[PDB]
Design an enzyme around this catalytic site. Structure first.
Site, PDB file in Angstrom:
ATOM      1  N   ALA A 240       0.812  -1.208   0.000  1.00  0.00           N
ATOM      2  CA  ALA A 240       0.000   0.000   0.000  1.00  0.00           C
ATOM      3  C   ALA A 240       0.855   1.271   0.000  1.00  0.00           C
ATOM      4  CB  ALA A 240      -0.928  -0.015   1.181  1.00  0.00           C
ATOM      5  N   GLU A 243       2.507   1.936  -3.482  1.00  0.00           N
ATOM      6  CA  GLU A 243       1.660   2.300  -4.629  1.00  0.00           C
ATOM      7  C   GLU A 243       0.462   3.237  -4.469  1.00  0.00           C
ATOM      8  OE1 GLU A 243       2.533   1.658  -7.607  1.00  0.00           O
ATOM      9  OE2 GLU A 243       4.074   0.142  -7.281  1.00  0.00           O
ATOM     10  N   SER A 245      -0.276   5.999  -2.387  1.00  0.00           N
ATOM     11  CA  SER A 245      -0.012   7.433  -2.373  1.00  0.00           C
ATOM     12  C   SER A 245       0.564   8.002  -3.658  1.00  0.00           C
ATOM     13  CB  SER A 245       0.860   7.790  -1.184  1.00  0.00           C
ATOM     14  OG  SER A 245       0.177   7.469   0.014  1.00  0.00           O
ATOM     15  N   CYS A 350     -10.307   1.947   4.919  1.00  0.00           N
ATOM     16  CA  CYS A 350      -8.856   2.072   4.816  1.00  0.00           C
ATOM     17  C   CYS A 350      -8.169   2.583   6.067  1.00  0.00           C
ATOM     18  CB  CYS A 350      -8.506   2.995   3.649  1.00  0.00           C
ATOM     19  SG  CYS A 350      -6.717   2.890   3.420  1.00  0.00           S
ATOM     20  N   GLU A 359       0.679  12.631   3.472  1.00  0.00           N
ATOM     21  CA  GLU A 359       1.551  12.642   2.306  1.00  0.00           C
ATOM     22  C   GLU A 359       0.969  13.451   1.155  1.00  0.00           C
ATOM     23  OE1 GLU A 359       1.945   8.392   1.667  1.00  0.00           O
ATOM     24  OE2 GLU A 359       3.853   8.329   2.661  1.00  0.00           O
TER      25      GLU A 359
HETATM   26  C1  HEM Z   1      -4.732   7.190  -1.509  1.00  0.00           C
HETATM   27  C2  HEM Z   1      -4.509   6.118  -0.708  1.00  0.00           C
HETATM   28  C3  HEM Z   1      -5.388   5.109  -0.354  1.00  0.00           C
HETATM   29  C4  HEM Z   1      -6.591   4.741  -0.864  1.00  0.00           C
HETATM   30  C5  HEM Z   1      -7.382   5.392  -1.975  1.00  0.00           C
HETATM   31  C6  HEM Z   1      -6.977   3.544  -0.176  1.00  0.00           C
HETATM   32  C7  HEM Z   1      -8.141   2.782  -0.398  1.00  0.00           C
HETATM   33  C8  HEM Z   1      -8.493   1.639   0.314  1.00  0.00           C
HETATM   34  C9  HEM Z   1      -9.726   0.922   0.157  1.00  0.00           C
HETATM   35  C10 HEM Z   1     -10.770   1.248  -0.907  1.00  0.00           C
HETATM   36  C11 HEM Z   1      -9.787  -0.018   1.110  1.00  0.00           C
HETATM   37  C12 HEM Z   1     -10.955  -0.940   1.424  1.00  0.00           C
HETATM   38  C13 HEM Z   1     -10.787  -2.259   0.658  1.00  0.00           C
HETATM   39  C14 HEM Z   1     -12.052  -3.107   0.597  1.00  0.00           C
HETATM   40  O1  HEM Z   1     -13.132  -2.634   1.024  1.00  0.00           O
HETATM   41  O2  HEM Z   1     -11.970  -4.241   0.079  1.00  0.00           O
HETATM   42  C15 HEM Z   1      -8.559   0.063   1.805  1.00  0.00           C
HETATM   43  C16 HEM Z   1      -8.185  -0.856   2.735  1.00  0.00           C
HETATM   44  C17 HEM Z   1      -6.980  -0.803   3.377  1.00  0.00           C
HETATM   45  N1  HEM Z   1      -5.963   0.097   3.111  1.00  0.00           N
HETATM   46 FE1  HEM Z   1      -5.969   1.605   1.912  1.00  0.00          FE
HETATM   47  N2  HEM Z   1      -6.020   3.210   0.788  1.00  0.00           N
HETATM   48  C18 HEM Z   1      -5.053   4.188   0.664  1.00  0.00           C
HETATM   49  C19 HEM Z   1      -3.848   4.151   1.330  1.00  0.00           C
HETATM   50  C20 HEM Z   1      -3.431   3.153   2.144  1.00  0.00           C
HETATM   51  C21 HEM Z   1      -2.212   3.191   2.835  1.00  0.00           C
HETATM   52  C22 HEM Z   1      -1.158   4.211   2.503  1.00  0.00           C
HETATM   53  C23 HEM Z   1      -2.166   2.158   3.708  1.00  0.00           C
HETATM   54  C24 HEM Z   1      -1.266   1.660   4.659  1.00  0.00           C
HETATM   55  C25 HEM Z   1       0.042   1.948   4.869  1.00  0.00           C
HETATM   56  C26 HEM Z   1      -3.401   1.456   3.447  1.00  0.00           C
HETATM   57  C27 HEM Z   1      -3.709   0.275   4.062  1.00  0.00           C
HETATM   58  C28 HEM Z   1      -4.933  -0.334   3.936  1.00  0.00           C
HETATM   59  C29 HEM Z   1      -5.328  -1.447   4.723  1.00  0.00           C
HETATM   60  C30 HEM Z   1      -4.453  -2.172   5.718  1.00  0.00           C
HETATM   61  C31 HEM Z   1      -6.609  -1.733   4.387  1.00  0.00           C
HETATM   62  C32 HEM Z   1      -7.482  -2.855   4.913  1.00  0.00           C
HETATM   63  C33 HEM Z   1      -8.339  -2.448   6.097  1.00  0.00           C
HETATM   64  C34 HEM Z   1      -9.258  -3.552   6.554  1.00  0.00           C
HETATM   65  O3  HEM Z   1      -9.497  -4.490   5.781  1.00  0.00           O
HETATM   66  O4  HEM Z   1      -9.748  -3.493   7.689  1.00  0.00           O
HETATM   67  N3  HEM Z   1      -4.185   2.090   2.513  1.00  0.00           N
HETATM   68  N4  HEM Z   1      -7.758   1.099   1.330  1.00  0.00           N
HETATM   69  C1  LIG Z   2     -12.417 -12.278  -2.367  1.00  0.00           C
HETATM   70  C2  LIG Z   2     -11.414 -11.387  -3.020  1.00  0.00           C
HETATM   71  O1  LIG Z   2     -10.926 -11.672  -4.089  1.00  0.00           O
HETATM   72  N1  LIG Z   2     -11.069 -10.271  -2.393  1.00  0.00           N
HETATM   73  C3  LIG Z   2     -11.622  -9.814  -1.131  1.00  0.00           C
HETATM   74  C4  LIG Z   2     -10.598  -9.019  -0.400  1.00  0.00           C
HETATM   75  N2  LIG Z   2     -10.397  -7.737  -1.049  1.00  0.00           N
HETATM   76  C5  LIG Z   2      -9.301  -6.989  -0.578  1.00  0.00           C
HETATM   77  C6  LIG Z   2      -9.364  -5.633  -0.359  1.00  0.00           C
HETATM   78  C7  LIG Z   2      -8.291  -4.893   0.071  1.00  0.00           C
HETATM   79  C8  LIG Z   2      -7.208  -5.579   0.305  1.00  0.00           C
HETATM   80  O2  LIG Z   2      -6.196  -4.716   0.670  1.00  0.00           O
HETATM   81  C9  LIG Z   2      -4.903  -5.234   0.978  1.00  0.00           C
HETATM   82  C10 LIG Z   2      -4.156  -3.924   1.075  1.00  0.00           C
HETATM   83  C11 LIG Z   2      -2.656  -3.907   0.652  1.00  0.00           C
HETATM   84  O3  LIG Z   2      -2.614  -2.942  -0.387  1.00  0.00           O
HETATM   85  C12 LIG Z   2      -3.878  -2.545  -0.788  1.00  0.00           C
HETATM   86  C13 LIG Z   2      -4.272  -1.718  -1.937  1.00  0.00           C
HETATM   87  N3  LIG Z   2      -4.477  -0.494  -1.318  1.00  0.00           N
HETATM   88  C14 LIG Z   2      -3.863   0.679  -1.556  1.00  0.00           C
HETATM   89  C15 LIG Z   2      -4.405   1.514  -0.670  1.00  0.00           C
HETATM   90  N4  LIG Z   2      -5.330   0.897   0.108  1.00  0.00           N
HETATM   91  C16 LIG Z   2      -5.344  -0.308  -0.313  1.00  0.00           C
HETATM   92  C17 LIG Z   2      -3.791  -3.633  -1.957  1.00  0.00           C
HETATM   93  C18 LIG Z   2      -4.701  -4.713  -1.992  1.00  0.00           C
HETATM   94  C19 LIG Z   2      -4.682  -5.690  -2.968  1.00  0.00           C
HETATM   95  C20 LIG Z   2      -3.730  -5.635  -3.971  1.00  0.00           C
HETATM   96 CL1  LIG Z   2      -3.710  -6.876  -5.193  1.00  0.00          CL
HETATM   97  C21 LIG Z   2      -2.799  -4.604  -4.024  1.00  0.00           C
HETATM   98  C22 LIG Z   2      -2.824  -3.623  -3.034  1.00  0.00           C
HETATM   99 CL2  LIG Z   2      -1.587  -2.383  -3.211  1.00  0.00          CL
HETATM  100  O4  LIG Z   2      -4.873  -3.124  -0.034  1.00  0.00           O
HETATM  101  C23 LIG Z   2      -7.035  -6.930   0.165  1.00  0.00           C
HETATM  102  C24 LIG Z   2      -8.137  -7.662  -0.287  1.00  0.00           C
HETATM  103  C25 LIG Z   2     -10.373  -7.920  -2.537  1.00  0.00           C
HETATM  104  C26 LIG Z   2     -10.073  -9.341  -2.969  1.00  0.00           C
END
Ligand code: HEM
Ligand SMILES: CC(=O)N1CCN(c2ccc(OC[C@H]3CO[C@](Cn4ccnc4)(c4ccc(Cl)cc4Cl)O3)cc2)CC1
Length: 403
Positions: A240, A243, A245, A350, A359
């Site tokens: 995350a 990629e 940010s 997220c 950032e």
């Molecule tokens: C512009 C930046 C970001 C966007 C647009 C974004 C977007 C998202 C989205 C849409 C999800 C929910 C995924 C789902 O519902 O399946 C998510 C989950 C998550 N993101 Fe990001 N994210 C951002 C940055 C980051 C960064 C920088 C980190 C961590 C260093 C991060 C860590 C995570 C984690 C750990 C989750 C999973 C949370 C959970 O499942 O409880 N994300 N993010």
């Molecule tokens: C069932 C199935 O196929 N699923 C259900 C679970 N879903 C899901 C949603 C978010 C998720 O986040 C993990 C974390 C680690 O990084 C991210 C992407 N990202 C960037 C910012 N916030 C999230 C990420 C996620 C997946 C991939 Cl390929 C690349 C990346 Cl950078 O999500 C991991 C899994 C999607 C896939």
């Protein structure tokens, strides 16, 4: 009937026009992706409903009697590396999701993120010092990209000789092209190995970084992170930071540049920047689609989605639904961005939001405050958009600094 192919240029060229066409026809429609059937949710209320419905699972590891499903994000991944990419928060359902998120939130706090602001600002400055004050540079390669990477590597304890290589691997993972499934699969195995060594070294030589913190973290009732959980969480956090940010900074830079009016507002009012970042995210959401699996039959927006279906919630299409956002195609830094789905919705919201916002604001503030004449080096129409529904972005953005 005719079923949309998410692989077609229609979903990568002026794609927000296609999303609108689908949404007006049917907010929840069946489509095809990577030679597999799925349900694309393009409507706002439908996306929100789906994200909130726990009958739609986020866990790819679960086995159902007679069902064998391969979700797109794991295209070309051997089962063992898949497991390494899928034993973390985003790939878990309650109650596993609950404790994993609880334990990680104990260390990945707003305090730790905020404490890194001076460093993030320091890093931004240095990067800008070396780009120059004249000429055309690739603001992505020289700025948008390295900043997030230096930040996440410091947070996680990833040394200089590790970055760069890791970078070319995660870039590969971002593309889901069936012809490159092998190469994608290979890069995923490299990232998994890298992480295994990182965690091993970290256990041997402790520090005060986030990874060190996650290794000792434990709760009275929840215990601690198992080896696998720790490994997967680290891989996912690193991924995350490497990629997410970048997409924001780069897309944000491209939008302000193409919207002089909006930019000027920011320049004039610095307090306007925080909401500017929120609008950039709503306008072109990096995570265009998120995936869910229907463990049960679920009715969304009047459509019954058969059990064992794969649902692709188009977060980005939802952000451009007129019912929720009037004149959605209007980039407006002043707009009420409340409720957008770019950071998720529900239990998987997220958790890196604080970091992404810090950032994003610091970077654009410095970029534009430092270069009051910054302009685009190419024709706006000639900008190349990364072909990924996983994380939309720009890999190359030439800008002219001095004029
Ligand atoms: C512009 C930046 C970001 C966007 C647009 C974004 C977007 C998202 C989205 C849409 C999800 C929910 C995924 C789902 O519902 O399946 C998510 C989950 C998550 N993101 Fe990001 N994210 C951002 C940055 C980051 C960064 C920088 C980190 C961590 C260093 C991060 C860590 C995570 C984690 C750990 C989750 C999973 C949370 C959970 O499942 O409880 N994300 N993010
Ligand atoms: C069932 C199935 O196929 N699923 C259900 C679970 N879903 C899901 C949603 C978010 C998720 O986040 C993990 C974390 C680690 O990084 C991210 C992407 N990202 C960037 C910012 N916030 C999230 C990420 C996620 C997946 C991939 Cl390929 C690349 C990346 Cl950078 O999500 C991991 C899994 C999607 C896939």
């Amino acid at each position: 009937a005719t079923v949309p192919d998410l692989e077609s240029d229609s979903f990568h060229v002026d794609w927000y026009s296609t999303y609108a066409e689908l949404r007006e026809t049917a907010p929840v429609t069946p489509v095809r992706f990577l030679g597999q059937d799925a349900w694309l949710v393009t409507g706002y209320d439908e996306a929100k409903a789906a994200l909130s419905d726990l009958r739609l699972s986020s866990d790819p590891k679960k086995k159902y009697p007679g069902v064998e499903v391969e979700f797109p994000a794991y295209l070309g991944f051997p089962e063992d590396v898949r497991n390494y990419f899928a034993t973390n928060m985003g790939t878990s359902d309650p109650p596993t999701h609950t404790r994993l998120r609880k334990l990680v939130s104990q260390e990945f706090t707003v305090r730790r993120v905020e404490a890194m602001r001076p460093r993030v600002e320091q890093i931004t400055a240095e990067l800008l010092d070396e780009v120059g004050d004249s000429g055309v540079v690739d603001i992505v390669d020289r700025f948008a990209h390295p900043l997030p990477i230096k930040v996440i590597c410091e947070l996680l304890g990833v040394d200089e000789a590790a970055r760069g290589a890791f970078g070319r691997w995660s870039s590969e993972i971002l593309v889901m092209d069936p012809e490159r499934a092998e190469q994608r699969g290979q890069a995923a195995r490299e990232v998994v190995n890298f992480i295994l060594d990182l965690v091993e070294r970290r256990r041997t030589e402790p520090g005060d970084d986030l990874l060190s913190a996650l290794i000792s973290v434990q709760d009275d009732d929840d215990g601690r992170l198992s080896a696998d959980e720790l490994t997967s969480i680290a891989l996912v956090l690193l991924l995350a930071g490497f990629e997410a940010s970048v997409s924001l900074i780069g897309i944000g830079t491209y939008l302000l540049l193409t919207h002089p009016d909006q930019l000027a507002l920011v320049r004039a009012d610095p307090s306007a920047l925080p909401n500017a970042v929120e609008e950039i995210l709503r306008y072109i959401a990096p995570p265009e689609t998120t995936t869910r699996f229907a463990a049960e039959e679920v009715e969304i927006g009047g459509v019954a989605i058969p059990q064992y279906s794969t649902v692709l919630v188009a977060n980005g299409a939802a952000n451009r639904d007129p019912s929720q956002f009037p004149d959605p195609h209007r980039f407006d830094v002043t707009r009420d961005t409340r409720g957008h789905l770019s950071f998720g919705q529900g239990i998987h919201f997220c958790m890196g939001r604080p970091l992404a916002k810090l950032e994003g604001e610091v970077a654009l503030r410095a970029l534009f405050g430092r270069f009051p004449a910054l302009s685009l080096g190419i024709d706006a129409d000639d900008v190349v958009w990364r072909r990924s529904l996983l994380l939309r972005g720009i890999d190359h953005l030439p800008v002219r600094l001095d004029g």
